[PDB]
Amino acid sequence: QANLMRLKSDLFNRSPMYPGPTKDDPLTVTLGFTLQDIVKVDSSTNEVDLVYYEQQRWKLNSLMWDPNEYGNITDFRTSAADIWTPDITAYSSTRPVQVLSPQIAVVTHDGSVMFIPAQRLSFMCDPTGVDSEEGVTCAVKFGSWVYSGFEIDLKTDTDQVDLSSYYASSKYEILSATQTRQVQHYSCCPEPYIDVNLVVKFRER
Amino acid sequence: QANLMRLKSDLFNRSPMYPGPTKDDPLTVTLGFTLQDIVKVDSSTNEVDLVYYEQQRWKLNSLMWDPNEYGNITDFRTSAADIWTPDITAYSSTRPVQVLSPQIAVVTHDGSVMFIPAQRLSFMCDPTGVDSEEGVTCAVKFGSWVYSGFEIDLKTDTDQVDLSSYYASSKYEILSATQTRQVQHYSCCPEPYIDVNLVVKFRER
Amino acid sequence: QANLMRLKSDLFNRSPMYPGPTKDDPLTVTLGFTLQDIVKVDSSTNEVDLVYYEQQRWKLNSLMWDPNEYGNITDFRTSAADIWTPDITAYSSTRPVQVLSPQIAVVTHDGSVMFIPAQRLSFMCDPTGVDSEEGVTCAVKFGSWVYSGFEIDLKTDTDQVDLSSYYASSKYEILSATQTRQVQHYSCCPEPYIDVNLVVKFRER
Amino acid sequence: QANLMRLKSDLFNRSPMYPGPTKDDPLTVTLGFTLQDIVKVDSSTNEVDLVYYEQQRWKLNSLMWDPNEYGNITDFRTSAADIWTPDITAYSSTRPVQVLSPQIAVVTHDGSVMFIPAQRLSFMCDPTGVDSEEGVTCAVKFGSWVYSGFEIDLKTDTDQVDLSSYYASSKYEILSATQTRQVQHYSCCPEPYIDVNLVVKFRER
Amino acid sequence: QANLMRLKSDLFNRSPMYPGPTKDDPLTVTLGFTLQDIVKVDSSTNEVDLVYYEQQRWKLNSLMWDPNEYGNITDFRTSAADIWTPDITAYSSTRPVQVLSPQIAVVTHDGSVMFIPAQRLSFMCDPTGVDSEEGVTCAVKFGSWVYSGFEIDLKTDTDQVDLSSYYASSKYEILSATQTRQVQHYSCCPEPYIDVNLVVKFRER
Ligand SMILES: O=C1C[C@@H]2OCC=C3CN4CC[C@]56c7ccccc7N1[C@H]5[C@H]2[C@H]3C[C@H]46
Ligand SMILES: O=C1C[C@@H]2OCC=C3CN4CC[C@]56c7ccccc7N1[C@H]5[C@H]2[C@H]3C[C@H]46
Ligand SMILES: O=C1C[C@@H]2OCC=C3CN4CC[C@]56c7ccccc7N1[C@H]5[C@H]2[C@H]3C[C@H]46
Ligand SMILES: O=C1C[C@@H]2OCC=C3CN4CC[C@]56c7ccccc7N1[C@H]5[C@H]2[C@H]3C[C@H]46
Ligand SMILES: O=C1C[C@@H]2OCC=C3CN4CC[C@]56c7ccccc7N1[C@H]5[C@H]2[C@H]3C[C@H]46
Ligand SMILES: O=C1C[C@@H]2OCC=C3CN4CC[C@]56c7ccccc7N1[C@H]5[C@H]2[C@H]3C[C@H]46
């Protein structure tokens, strides 16, 4: 429809793409996980596979508009390729992440963006003890691959992983699942890198 | 030939692409499933693999034309990349869906589109009981990834999955297969959501 | 060299792309299979894997030229991406077909095209009996995914599959292999649908 | 640097790409194999996997230049996608060939090109006897997919496969490995076809 | 923001891309490995799989700028596709390397670049003795595919692999891991090639 076509043209066809954040114009990315299932455990290679929805949110001044100028449109959906997205990645995957959903974002008129890719991830975890009452704990950090906390500030809205969509007939019972922001300085370099530590304790049903 | 070339140039090369539905101009997408086989059952990971044809229908005003101005052309085939297509996806897949057919659609002069991707899907299902007389029931929801019921309404022409192409020498006997529209709210979000729930009850033949 | 560059420019750069066949301007695609090996039999999932060359031939008026105008060039080779190709698809594959050869076609001055992709196909087949003297029969239909017989007709040059390149040390002996044009009529629709049925009867050697 | 940028611009931006060889202007491609390892043997499917470097060499008038006109530049490297490359392919692979290295060619001022991709190939071979003192022989032919001997002639610099890079701790001992030009006529076609027959005799070490 | 947009436009949009190093203008690439885990050992195929970060650094005059002309910007992140990158490859992989991180690099105003792809690599290694106290040693060389030491030289900052991020619950104990620059004259080629030899001695923990 007319007004939305006009809006997208104005936002995407008139200016160079947003080049990403810098120290002088940093960006906060909010990150949250919805765990769907632990789909595989391999005790011979120490690899565990998760399926989850990863919710990312950020806000750009360059994506703002006045709804009155565009037929009262307050938000729209658009391919994630049309916009800048943050390079948030798992620090200890063992295979390329697999994307399970369309790559499409929702942009709201205040310039906020929501992008929630469904993914299957293989990561490093020794599952020894998963077949016991105590279960086993695995952990994987997510964070920007090359932006420091001076450019991208990561945060969470809550430290509790969302389990309301966890598969009811999973081989595994989730004992706990938290997602915790950490600020780390690595030996080589003075700038902080932010991560969100996904920590899941589980056992066989 | 010349008339079809002209029609496609007018439909596709003269205006911005359709930007997708909105709350003001919502769209109805009709879904239908043709189940071909249950090709894998994994009781160690609770994953089941299906091969099916997914029929999708919708109608756009911007794809309409008068056959009289285009040599009586009443419909045409065109690459799916030339047109907007709905972001219908399975909500509980465990691996990227694999497409088995050419991505080509049929567009009719009244603006209606028919697109029928053949797919192999791995999804979450505990198959315990499949080797019994009672069998086992699996279920997977399909719906838009990013549009709520505000923008995309879904429906089925029938609640019965088409089994007329089900592989006659399958490992599995289909006891029942239904495709039902559901309306649902999620704790994550304020909008009504619409999905089509594919429910298949089956046993080893 | 110069004449061939000029010809390709005239054929591909100077006109809109051919929009494919229609009822008014139908096409005939000739199909022929060269079976190289039956490379896998899976009796747990009822899947069988074939490697073969699939020969496709058709003719377009828009690909004709007078050799006298182009230095006696009578044919040329070019990327299949440069030309329209028919959407011939296996109707019962269980995985995306894998292409084993370069996608390059031969175009002749009468407008005729020859394209012969080598492929690995997994398709639905219960191989029970393969280890017996009588062997087992598998079948898979190939046809246009989106076109009816009103736009694309199919034929074979011979109903006998070419076994002259069948792997001499294969695990399997081919007892018979045929490729037969078939017509399918559906209650819903006046237009006939065409396929070529590849039927292979085989046993362990 | 400046001189090289100018040369590449002159070679690749001012003329349409070379349209490949023809009967009038045929091309000789020289082929050589460097076998690194036999990395899998499957006696249940009769498939063997090789890892090797495949050296291809040819020469094009259109790639020539006077080094005196370009700052004494005598050769340069560029992405293989920048230039025409021959459609040399294994005739009996069972899976798409996997490329293990960058795809970059070396171009020399006399118009000669050298391109040496590292590859992993699965191909048809019954390995029965590999565990014996006699070993087993496998063979796979390589040649143009669409060009006859009238357009592309193949040759080797030597009949002996290069084993100087063969993995010192391979599971397999190479007893002989040859690469031999063959001219063949096929019933399918009236003109001669050229292949290089890679023949490897090996046993478990 | 505005200044970064201008910088990228000036660096990338205003001039031809860097055509890579030459004998007249050679380059030095610094390599460092951070070994995260030995994720698979296959004694039937002699293949071992590593997961590591590979840090690459180089410097280009054409990537320099004066921060005073660009709002004090001293560095920026950009897609690796925007810049030239060196063709550093493992010389003995058995499968295509899998990239685990976004392909993005950091460019600094002196023209230096830092690119750190995380990767999973399968490579040739007979792991016999891995299950002993002595352990086993594997090695894989990394170097330019097409540039000799006269065009691309390599160096490490240290000959010790960074083991600070090695998975604490790995199946394998690392006995030693070094990364050493080597110069090699291969019988195939008159100019020597430089590699960094990654040598890992390990055993089951
Ligand atoms: O020193 C490190 C190790 C640490 O490893 C976890 C993952 C990280 C994500 N990216 C990958 C490269 C890295 C980085 C950038 C600049 C200097 C050092 C450095 N790294 C990793 C680091 C974090 C942050 C960043
Ligand atoms: O937490 C959820 C689960 C629910 O799953 C079914 C599919 C949905 C379609 N889209 C996919 C992403 C989702 C959504 C957005 C923001 C936070 C959580 C979230 N999801 C899914 C949700 C619905 C609605 C929406
Ligand atoms: O009734 C069918 C089933 C059959 O399935 C195999 C594949 C086919 C390729 N396309 C997909 C849609 C289809 C078709 C068109 C019109 C009415 C029925 C109908 N189909 C499939 C059919 C063939 C032909 C065609
Ligand atoms: O236009 C179509 C194509 C599609 O093909 C897959 C199978 C289907 C199952 N049945 C077979 C006939 C069909 C149908 C009925 C009425 C008009 C069109 C039409 N078809 C197929 C269709 C689905 C649904 C239905
Ligand atoms: O019937 C054949 C088999 C033979 O197989 C080996 C490889 C060849 C290289 N290309 C691949 C396609 C082929 C060809 C073209 C047209 C009709 C049949 C046909 N083929 C192969 C043939 C040769 C020559 C040519
Ligand atoms: O024969 C070889 C083996 C050697 O292997 C290690 C890596 C090298 C880097 N590039 C990759 C291709 C190679 C080369 C070019 C032309 C003929 C043979 C050939 N190779 C490798 C060689 C070096 C140099 C060069």
Author numbering:
A (entry chain B), B (entry chain A), C (entry chain E), D (entry chain D), E (entry chain C): 1 to 205
What do the authors of the reporting publication say about this deposited model?
Cys-loop receptors are a class of pentameric ligand-gated ion channels that are activated by specific neurotransmitters, including acetylcholine (ACh), serotonin (5-HT), glycine (Gly), and γ-aminobutyric acid (GABA). Recently, Gao et al. characterized an extensive set of mutants in acetylcholine binding protein (AChBP), a structural and functional homolog of the extracellular domain of the nAChR. Using X-ray crystallography we solved 3-dimensional structures of strychnine or d-tubocurarine in complex with ACh binding protein (AChBP), a well-recognized structural homolog of the nicotinic ACh receptor. Our results demonstrate that AChBP binds strychnine and d-TC with high affinity and serves as an appropriate model for mapping the binding site topography in different CLRs, including the GlyR, nAChR, and 5-HT3R.
The affinity of strychnine for Ac-AChBP (Ki = 38.0±3.3 nM) is more than 100-fold higher than for α7 nAChR (Ki = 4,854±133 nM) and is actually close to the high affinity of strychnine reported for the α1 GlyR (Ki = 16±2 nM). The crystal structure of Aplysia AChBP in complex with strychnine contains 1 pentamer in the asymmetric unit. Inspection of simple difference electron density unambiguously revealed the ligand orientation in all five binding sites of the pentamer. Remarkably, one of the two C loops involved in forming a crystal contact is in a more extended conformation and reveals electron density for a second strychnine molecule in the same binding site. The first strychnine molecule, which contacts the (+) face, is pivoted by 48° around the N-atom relative to the strychnine molecule in all other four binding sites (single occupancy in yellow and double occupancy in magenta). The second strychnine molecule, which contacts the (−) face, is stacked onto the first molecule in a mirrored upside-down orientation and both molecules are separated by a distance of 3.6 Å. In the binding site with double occupancy, the tip of loop C is displaced outward by a distance of 5.6 Å relative to the binding sites with single occupancy. First, strychnine forms contacts with the following residues on the (+) face: Y91, S144, W145, C188, C189, Y193 and (−) face: Y53, Q55, M114, I116, D162, S165. Three additional contacts are formed in the binding site with double ligand occupancy, namely Y186 on the (+) face and T34, R57 on the (−) face. Because the C-loop interacting with 2 strychnine molecules also interfaces with a C-loop from a neighboring pentamer the double strychnine occupancy might be the result of a crystal contact.
